[PDB]
Structures are given as structure tokens and as C-alpha cells.
Design a protein around this ligand. Structure first.
Ligand SMILES: [Ca+2]
Ligand SMILES: [Ca+2]
Lengths: 49, 49
């Protein structure tokens, strides 16, 4: 879904993922849980309403 | 019959031509070649000469 492509020098990256229209989807969903399946099996992110 | 004015001379010259040093510059283009510098990146760059 999101492919992070780095240049030949960058080695350490800290990404802040943020859900902006969650207050709108609150009117449509009752529970929604997004797990960002990270690099090689790790799951480093979890977003909800 | 002559009253000699007793004064003979010797002379010499000193030649100061150059300035003591030549600071030959070979400037550095540090992103270099076959490398990459990215925004926010951290590292080291080396130029031997
Ligand atoms: Ca000179
Ligand atoms: Ca770096």
C-alpha cells in the first residue's frame, strides 16, 4: 500500500501517519482498526477512529 | 698637494621576490559523484587533498 523508497544515504526514518477524516468515517463505521503491516512482518502502526 | 677625502665604498643588494607560501586550492563538491545527500540527512564527507 505505501512503499517507502529512500535515497542511497538515508538510513533512519521516523514517519508520523495521521488519519484526518476519521471524524467523518465515525458516522459510517462502528469500529475500524488499521494495522500498518510494516517492513518484514513487523506491525509498527495501529490507527483507529 | 691634495688633501684626500678618505672615503671608499662597498655595496650589496638583497632580493626578496616571492611570498612564503602557495595555498593551492582544489575545492570539494561534497554531494560527490555516485553518492547522494538528502534533506535532514546525517553523515560524513572526506576529501584527502
Ligand atoms: Ca606566489
Ligand atoms: Ca546518512
Amino acid at each position: 500500500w505505501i512503499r517507502v523508497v529512500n535515497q542511497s544515504d538515508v538510513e533512519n526514518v521516523k514517519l508520523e501517519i495521521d488519519w484526518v477524516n476519521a471524524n467523518q468515517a465515525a458516522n459510517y463505521f462502528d469500529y475500524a482498526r488499521i494495522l500498518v503491516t510494516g517492513p518484514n512482518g513487523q506491525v509498527k502502526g495501529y490507527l483507529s477512529l | 698637494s691634495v688633501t684626500s677625502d678618505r672615503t671608499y665604498y662597498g655595496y650589496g643588494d638583497v632580493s626578496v621576490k616571492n611570498e612564503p607560501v602557495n595555498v593551492v586550492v582544489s575545492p570539494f563538491s561534497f554531494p560527490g559523484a555516485n553518492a547522494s545527500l538528502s534533506s535532514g540527512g546525517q553523515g560524513v564527507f572526506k576529501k584527502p587533498d
